[PDB]
Amino acid sequence: EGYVLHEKKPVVPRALRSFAFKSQDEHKSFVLARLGIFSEEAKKIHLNELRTFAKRDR
RNA sequence: UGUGACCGUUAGCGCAUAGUACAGUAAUGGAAGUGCAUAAACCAAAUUAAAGGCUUAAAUUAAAAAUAAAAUGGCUGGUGCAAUGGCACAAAAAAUAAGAAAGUUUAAA
Ligand SMILES: [Mg+2]
Ligand SMILES: [Mg+2]
């Protein structure tokens, strides 16, 4: 019936999570170290984190 | 002062100040310690999955926007980025030598 209908996100094994998110963690450190917390890039990251936390409540 | 296919907090000086704290009767020996951010070991919590019958022929839409889990809570301080700290010599300056012994030299207009 199509990709959109049957698409699913795989679950990362607990032991492999430090490798799946290595790049994202580095970027956040890169932004805060160079641009600071009062930056447009920093605000975007925080907004994305709010979305993740809100979805934990199910 | 100048330069670097020299280092970037387990590195580079022992020291991003400290020959301090501390050990020793003494001579002496001699640390740890920058700023920011979901790394690892590590301890607690999280098992499972069910559903069986409204009668169908003239809607809506300025425009645009707006429905979906990659990630538990902690303790710890690795990695990534930056330098009011170090390393090596170079340039300039400084230091340095006289034969004689109570004696004369070396001064550019
Ligand atoms: Mg560090
Ligand atoms: Mg050191």
Buried b (16+ CB within 10 A) or exposed e, A14-45: eeeeeeeeeeeeeeeeebeeeeeeeeeeeeee
> Per the structure block, which two tokens stand in for A19?
């490798």
Distance, Å, A5 CA → B61 C1': 25
Residue with tokens 């790049």: A23
Q: What is the rounded CA–CA span in Å between residue A19 and residue A55?
A: 23
The DSSP secondary-structure symbol of A39 reads S
Distance CA A50, CA A55 (A): 9
| CA–CA dist A5, A3 (Å, integer) | 6
Residue A20 CB lies within 7 Å of the nucleic strand B: yes
**A9 Cβ nearer than 7 Å to chain B strand:** yes
Q: How far is the CA of A41 from the C1' of B74 (A)?
A: 29
Residue for token digits 């032991």? Answer: A15
What distance, in Å, lies between the first and last C-alpha atoms of chain A?
29
Distance CA A15, CA A45 (A): 25
**Nearest to residue A25, comparing CAs of A54, A47, A49, A1?**
A49
Resolution of the determined structure in angstroms stands at 3.1
